[PDB]
Enzyme design. Sequence first.
Site: not given
Length: 754
Positions: A180, A230, A239
């Site tokens: 992210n 996560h 990811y």
Amino acid sequence: PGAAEFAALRNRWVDQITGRNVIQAGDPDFAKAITALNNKAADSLAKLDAAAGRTSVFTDLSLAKDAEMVTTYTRLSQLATAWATPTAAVFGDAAVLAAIKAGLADANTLCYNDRKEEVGNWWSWEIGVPRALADAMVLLHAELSAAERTAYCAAIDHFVPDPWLQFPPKRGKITSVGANRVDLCQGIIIRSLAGEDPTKLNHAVAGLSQVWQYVTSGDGIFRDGSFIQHSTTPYTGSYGVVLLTGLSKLFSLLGGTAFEVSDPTRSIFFDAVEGSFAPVMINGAMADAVRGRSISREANTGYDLGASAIEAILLLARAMDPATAARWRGLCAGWIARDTYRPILNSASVPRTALVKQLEATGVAPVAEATGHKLFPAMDRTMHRGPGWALSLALSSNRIAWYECGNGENNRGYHTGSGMTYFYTSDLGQYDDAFWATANYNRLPGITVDTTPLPDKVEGQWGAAVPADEWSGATALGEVAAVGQHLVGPGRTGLTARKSWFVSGDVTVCLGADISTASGAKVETIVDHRNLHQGSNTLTTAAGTIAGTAGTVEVLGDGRWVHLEGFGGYAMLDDSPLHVLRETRSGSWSGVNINGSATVQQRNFATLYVNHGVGPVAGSYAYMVAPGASVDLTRKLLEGNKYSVIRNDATAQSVEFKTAKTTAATFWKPGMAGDLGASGPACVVFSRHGNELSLAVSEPTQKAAGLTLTLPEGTWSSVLEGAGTLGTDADGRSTLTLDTTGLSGKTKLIKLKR
Ligand SMILES: CC(=O)N[C@@H]1[C@@H](O[C@@H]2O[C@H](C(=O)O)[C@@H](O[C@@H]3O[C@H](CO)[C@H](OS(=O)(=O)O)[C@H](O[C@@H]4OC(C(=O)O)=C[C@H](O)[C@H]4O)[C@H]3NC(C)=O)[C@H](O)[C@H]2O)[C@@H](OS(=O)(=O)O)[C@@H](CO)O[C@H]1O
Ligand code: NA
């Protein structure tokens, strides 16, 4: 930081995302890449909303649904990509240009502007739209006005005022991490090229540095090479690949400029290419056990994610020292050459095609996947390889969730963390050819499972719950690994099982003990559940064949072994009945993912299992798998005490490999397995060579300050390699006492002399 420097950076980004400077004339793979580009562009233009006073840009995408707003913008950026790519059908087409510009203008007026509050998934507003709108601004810089740039930059800055943070104000903003952080910094960097904003560009570059610092909890890269996103899900393969892709593009963009990434700790990211990504790459695919909920995606597969990792590694290799560049290129050439199932150039973009062509032109030779063991104790994953196979084990524990589901994806995956044994082989499509649309999610290979039906999303979304188990962990010495999992079942059934795996250079011995549950339902252990595609592969036994009729389960006769055509051998190490089922299964990708197609896929499976029955009291199993073994070799597995079970109960599980002269063990309680003892939870592998004893040891709970072994093979009086303190017990046996404070499940290697 000036106008000429910003123009050069925009022109470099357009070169990188179009391949416009590297198309080879008359090359058939470039032509195929342009054709794919043309067909997608034509598809989008056919869906334009032409209506007066339109309220959407595409007739099949509502701006009131956040995921369809993202696809509106990614279609517009693809169209701009095509408009900027020499030889594309719409290259330089003024009518297509006008339609892109009107789509960006109306999507801004109608929906994505600096007065709009987020609705729905934060990721759409902060990552999905900004990356695509920033790309479109840069591709169209010579065509957009100053007022259009001001409007679109203001919209992006409204949703993402600071890419070090995420979430809309109403939620409370948190630090962005891992994939992210990379994706937020990418959207702001490209937006800073369009608006010529050195202050925002510098801050976004500085934000990259956090993503490659080592962590010991939370999300990020661990020193053992694990990658978690996560909090509780092993995530190198999806990811981790997002992080790898975005850093490769940004590093290449900025290199040699006033904004170059200069932090020397980026060496940690470079070390992750072999430390984290390479061991979970298998013939071009990322292992399913490290890609979380993406297993449920028909068109985001292990091969799609491995092909993106290959493109990124090739792009990063251009900047490395010569030895490292050639090593990474050799790894990539091997993952490309061995993959005849989803060849990387089929449907590749122009940039991906250019990197693959550049690699082929270096002449760098393909590197084979090394045999042996790669352990990732921080994320409860292990990899094991031998000639023709790779085993990936998927465990769970008080640190690692059973599974991640979320956004309508992988809601049925609740047994995927119950001790799965993925045997990857030359059957390259085993886990990709509609496996996740058709497999029995209650009989996944290797698991122990309470047959109580569980609801979709049992234990919650986003990996929020983890099993409160005793430990999961592993160790390895030379060619033999020991892996253990205390399984606690999902869904509050009370299922408990002690599962261990002892993995040599060829065979995997699977021991289970202390199995019970509170639900009242039967418990099974799955020797395999194996996709046969449309095949009728023969299951051979001592007496003849078994399970010749689809749908009729049969029990193995007396020989204790079964060979599956095209795979290898299985053999029982105890006198328990083995149930064998040939079955045909059907399902759609829509049944496992809200976005999946409705098309029904039908596949044949071989399913082999032990039934522990209702109300087992200290139920157990013992079997082995020999991937690639012939019928003759499978018939011989149980002869000559090659795989010698020592103990298999609630205290310890252990086997000796006769040929390798090596013994492996897991300990659940203080006690002895043959002539080896441990004072507490342990994984141990040992081998004597004459007057020297070699040992590998881990303390798998990750919380004990010490561990003491009672040593096998006689007495031992000095330490040749490693650390530890020798002692003597009450019965005259040698002891070895280790300081295991803070070892985080890592292995200690020791060598003793008699
Ligand atoms: C709804 C909500 O608040 N949930 C959060 C949860 O956020 C969710 O998790 C991720 C995230 O980025 O953290 C985000 O996942 C990404 O979603 C998009 C679509 O939204 C893509 O999925 S796909 O469209 O189905 O393929 C994206 O996939 C990847 O995309 C790309 C690319 O665009 O470059 C490349 C890869 O090939 C592909 O795998 C997907 N990422 C992956 C890797 O799957 C969700 O959209 C977002 O809702 C978490 O938030 S967090 O910020 O704390 O991480 C979660 C953490 O516990 O908390 C929930 O509340
Ligand atoms: Na989680």
